Amino acid sequence: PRLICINDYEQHAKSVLPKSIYDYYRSGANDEETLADNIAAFSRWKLYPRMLRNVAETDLSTSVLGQRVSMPICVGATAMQRMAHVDGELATVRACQSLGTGMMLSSWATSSIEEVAEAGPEALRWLQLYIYKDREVTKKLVRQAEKMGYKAIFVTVDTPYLGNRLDDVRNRFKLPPQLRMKNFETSTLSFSPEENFGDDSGLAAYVAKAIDPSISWEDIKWLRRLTSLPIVAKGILRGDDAREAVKHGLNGILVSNHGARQLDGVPATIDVLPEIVEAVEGKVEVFLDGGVRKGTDVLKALALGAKAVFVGRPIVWGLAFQGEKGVQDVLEILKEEFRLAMALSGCQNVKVIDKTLVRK
Amino acid sequence: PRLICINDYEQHAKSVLPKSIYDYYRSGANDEETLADNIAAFSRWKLYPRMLRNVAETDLSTSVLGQRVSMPICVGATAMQRMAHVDGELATVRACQSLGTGMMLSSWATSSIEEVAEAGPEALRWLQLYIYKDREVTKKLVRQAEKMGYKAIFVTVDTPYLGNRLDDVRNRFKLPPQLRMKNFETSTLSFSPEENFGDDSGLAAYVAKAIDPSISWEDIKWLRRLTSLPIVAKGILRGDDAREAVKHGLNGILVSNHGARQLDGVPATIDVLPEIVEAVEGKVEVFLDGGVRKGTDVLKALALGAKAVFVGRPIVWGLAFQGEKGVQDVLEILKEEFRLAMALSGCQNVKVIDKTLVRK
Amino acid sequence: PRLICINDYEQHAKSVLPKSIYDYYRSGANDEETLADNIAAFSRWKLYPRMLRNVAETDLSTSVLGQRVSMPICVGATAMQRMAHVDGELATVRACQSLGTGMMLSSWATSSIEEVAEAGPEALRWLQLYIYKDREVTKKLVRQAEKMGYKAIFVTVDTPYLGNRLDDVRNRFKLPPQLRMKNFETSTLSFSPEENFGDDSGLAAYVAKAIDPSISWEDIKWLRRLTSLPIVAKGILRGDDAREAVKHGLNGILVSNHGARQLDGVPATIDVLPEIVEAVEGKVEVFLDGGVRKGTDVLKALALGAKAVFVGRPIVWGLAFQGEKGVQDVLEILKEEFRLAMALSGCQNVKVIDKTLVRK
Amino acid sequence: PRLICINDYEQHAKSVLPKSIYDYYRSGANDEETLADNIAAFSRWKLYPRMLRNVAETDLSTSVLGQRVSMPICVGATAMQRMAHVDGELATVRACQSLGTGMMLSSWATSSIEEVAEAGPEALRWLQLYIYKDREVTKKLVRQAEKMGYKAIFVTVDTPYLGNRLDDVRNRFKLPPQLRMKNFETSTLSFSPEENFGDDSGLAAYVAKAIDPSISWEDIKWLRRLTSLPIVAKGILRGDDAREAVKHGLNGILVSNHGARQLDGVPATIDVLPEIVEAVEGKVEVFLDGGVRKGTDVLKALALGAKAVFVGRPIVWGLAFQGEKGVQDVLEILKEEFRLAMALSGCQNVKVIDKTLVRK
Numbered sequence A, B, C, D: 001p002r003l004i005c006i007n008d009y010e011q012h013a014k015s016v017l018p019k020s021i022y023d024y025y026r027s028g029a030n031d032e033e034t035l036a037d038n039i040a041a042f043s044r045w046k047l048y049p050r051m052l053r054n055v056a057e058t059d060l061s062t063s064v065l066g067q068r069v070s071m072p073i074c075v076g077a078t079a080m081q082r083m084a085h086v087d088g089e090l091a092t093v094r095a096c097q098s099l100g101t102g103m104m105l106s107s108w109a110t111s112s113i114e115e116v117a118e119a120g121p122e123a124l125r126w127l128q129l130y131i132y133k134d135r136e137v138t139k140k141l142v143r144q145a146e147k148m149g150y151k152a153i154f155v156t157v158d159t160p161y162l163g164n165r166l167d168d169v170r171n172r173f174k175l176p177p178q179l180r181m182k183n184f185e186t187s188t189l190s191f192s193p194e195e196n197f198g199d200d201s202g203l204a205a206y207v208a209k210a211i212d213p214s215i216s217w218e219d220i221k222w223l224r225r226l227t228s229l230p231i232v233a234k235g236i237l238r239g240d241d242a243r244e245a246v247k248h249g250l251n252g253i254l255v256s257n258h259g260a261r262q263l264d265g266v267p268a269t270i271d272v273l274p275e276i277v278e279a280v281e282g283k284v285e286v287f288l289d290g291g292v293r294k295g296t297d298v299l300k301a302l303a304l305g306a307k308a309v310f311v312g313r314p315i316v317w318g319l320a321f322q323g324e325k326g327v328q329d330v331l332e333i334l335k336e337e338f339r340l341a342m343a344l345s346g347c348q349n350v351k352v353i354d355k356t357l358v359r360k
Ligand SMILES: Cc1cc2nc3c(=O)[nH]c(=O)nc-3n(C[C@H](O)[C@H](O)[C@H](O)COP(=O)(O)O)c2cc1C
Pocket: A024, A025, A026, A038, A076, A077, A078, A079, A106, A107, A108, A128, A156, A234, A256, A257, A258, A259, A260, A261, A289, A290, A291, A292, A310, A311, A312, A313, A314, A316
């Protein structure tokens, strides 16, 4: 089928993925108020384009944490990508390498840190880290990322417990039989579908067993001493927490509500972005994810002070359509929509995308 | 059937309850504008969670009027519970005893004050009082509550006449043949379905015959002299009335619109809560009911200054599913959702649930 | 069928009236934005009831222009009532006489001024006047009203031309064959369905032929000199026009958008009421019509400073159900809903219905 | 079929036009947020009519850039009108001549500048100009307009690239075989459907090949030196760009979002109109297009300071119904709705249509 925008990809994915996998990928937490809002909020921000600016030569390039990227549109961590396509994370990293953009690799990937570095050696790669109760497991992940040429750690800070995703509970979500979380060396930590993970969501049970709910700023201190790699706090929604991340010597904030999958009824990320940008006082790069579907979404986040955005679900739908090629298609669609959004708004490059371009 | 959230319970209840009983339980007044709003309003209050607070050990316990409870989630008065399940109020009090939370017993219960105290002797129990034209009836109810170890009187002040519930009028609502309001000793006062209660809603006719529309602050004065038990004004919606309750030596306010069943077009209780908390100046505990369905609802009410919330309809749907076990399930679902909402918002206990957690 | 609220009456009317008649009665102008808003706006005004006020003895009585009425709910002018029921205006006035409220009689009634006075001699009656190009016709109507014991003139000021009601155009609306506008003595002025009234709405053509689009404040001056009866300006939507009516020695303002049938996209009458009440500075009574369907609508208009409200369409639906008895039913439903709305809001009588009862 | 308002015309058009042509005509850009808003925004602006102003003799006449018109309602440029009806632009100009209003002729017309001047010699005619990469092509268009008695140039400034219209991409939109853009003398520039215009929207490819994305204020300078005809900047959405147009010696601004077909998520034109009128300080006439469907839309734009409005899509639907006669019908409907909107709001002529008539 001919798919020409991101929404087309989701629709096709629903038609070809088994229910429990589609549901895992699509779902938000509880009543999914924030899931709807992540998208609605973008529509409330209106664009005020400048005309007659000469946009013959639009340059989409930028940098994330000192590393050059082809566009301010990067791949966010989405667990267990092999459920969507046999090649999962390997397909994803290859598409990123082709595009000249970065991939943030989930700690719960169905491919190892090493496997991913092998498949995309020239690709900009970062590790998304969950703090395990077992700090040696956690340390190993970080050390492996450093060894394998990953350029930053995105530490997820909004997941002391898993959000309650109703469909996952109903479907008793678990990995397909042939698949594992490939970063780990035990049946429990690798999320083996042959393992006892209770009678509800397998993933919620996995988090409860493996992930540390006691995670504090002290643990951020530990992490900051552990690695000299740039560290981004992922999942911040408040200006005071943002300032705290900066105080702790962190190098960035990813304004995120975990794609509306954690606490439901939190605001849309585009709505909190300005408070966070203001709080940080230019001291650290601020990124956004959550509900990015169109070039104009990217334009709005940048106008509001974000350095770059990350996409979660669109990538998984790309994979579901055609693995590597599907992901490349999705990224190219976003790139082209962004170029056009830039051109029609009078922006020659990302440096001239200013706050007067948007109003709520 | 597998029911995993409060809404699931309502759906099942509709499938197993006779129409007139389901309709009695579900209905609001007139066009049901406030009924919709009680729920919608919660969604408008957005959460601003703190991260990295150490939430390994979440403590949900609190106190209501000096009595310890396991969670700030209590059972509100809902008349005639035996329509939902053979055990009605007895099932309810047993579930409350198991949970370590309180039950507010309707004056229009299908089980006596004594029957309920016998079924849940260790349970925290309060009496919801309606002021009868017959003050000796009223006095008896209060004296019985004191004798039978009930810890407070919730005096309902928003029901000089019954609200107009359209479905009840259509169905000519009345008790099933085998059931009575068991606190009373005459055919009229016990709401006998064999009695003449007009051609419209039997309950509206019952109120008109039995309940005193002349109820004033003088009657509050009488009540305050009658018992030394704590007294909570239930059904207050204005700050000036709140201050008046405090002046009268009352010990609490339950901010309530009677589950949107009285005057339609009043605001949602979550929306008026702040005005009431402000009016009371910390002098008396303020509670809320109306539209509480999810853990995040409980979190929002507490963030806005409520000591605890009460649930009406969810309890009746629990009963409809499986009597005592159904009620326990509903309460446990609310408890768990609340725990998770607390954890994900960075709250170790109820004392740290502050106003910065919410914004309208 | 059992009909228990105003909406029930409209539904039944649609089932028993011929399409073109139902459509004439239901329609607003153009896209009907104001028609929807007249109702929606009432829902936006929220009620803040007082408790414990002693409402055993609710007194609904008031006065309109110095004449006592049983409730602040009166019958507004609706043309051609015999289309709805054989007895039309005669049924209506008889119901008003029974209720102890007033009837405002349309200049385009299917019953004469004299016929109506004969059918309801003791009923409070007012004449709604349209200014005809023929001033002798106009004068005759006024003189007849005076002779026949009518107590005021409601001069309609928002109809220099007829609003564009799309359904009427489609149906080529005209009177049924057996009926006339009975105040007039020629084929044209009596709106004979045997007459040439073009190929679009017969009523729009009738207005263009008969009604004076040149109507100015000078004509108000003429009217004010013509009769010593109280005169109310009906159809005012602006405070400046309100002040002008007062300057001209008029005795009242009916805040009206002609039931949303004239200019579409004007605000709801409940929304403009406050500006008008403020403009008038207590110098003249202010009334409202447009979208009144429920007792709480009446309560809100009074809280916002209206002396009384008028109902248009509900009366016609009463007629469609059962002529006189149907109208009486509709009025009694409104009366009872209003009583209950008063009682539940802590109002013993209309004098204590204050502005703190509502907030937008 | 009997069609009595603009919406009726669209509905009929959908029933008789081939899908790809209807879709081309109907579509907005991307998710069509602005397309919906262009219409919704008009409904948010509420009217505050004056009564008793004497509206017997309503005069709709005005002037655009010093040229008298019969009404402040003119025909906006819509490309390729022969797809809608065999006579296309020739039918349109004949209808405009009959109405005494102006036609703005698209540079992408399916009829030549000369053909159109021949068919409507007495009609007020303007040329809508796109700046071609080939400036000699561009110059020729301007010189032809001057020669053929066109009275102004509307330079479109919001189209450095074509907006992304999803349906056009899906349908692979192209001209029907028998048709060309008749102003041009090569296969590419005339948009020959036999030409290679890629695998997506033929029109997007045509723009990319033919239209200059480098267009700047320098090009406006060039245009202003090229012709002494009045020049209007079409597609301005910001006050700062408006001031820049004035500085450049331009004679007008058409506040336009290109009928929501360019950048999606820009505000409705009625919403930005006031900022633009304020920015211009009376120095230049300001016009509006986008979502004009009803007489009250025209009234609102004038109340907010627009000199006249242009209609795009309604004209094409007129054509689809009955070519010249269809266009005349559409224009006459708009004229009559506007007259009535004027009369009912107390406006004798366009000079008295003031800002107090509207409020958002
Ligand atoms: C299927 C799915 C799996 C996810 N897994 C992870 C994960 O493993 N680690 C993590 O930090 N965030 C995870 N997230 C959250 C994303 O990193 C990101 O914040 C979110 O997808 C952004 O919203 P979007 O999906 O609307 O683009 C996941 C999100 C989805 C939708």
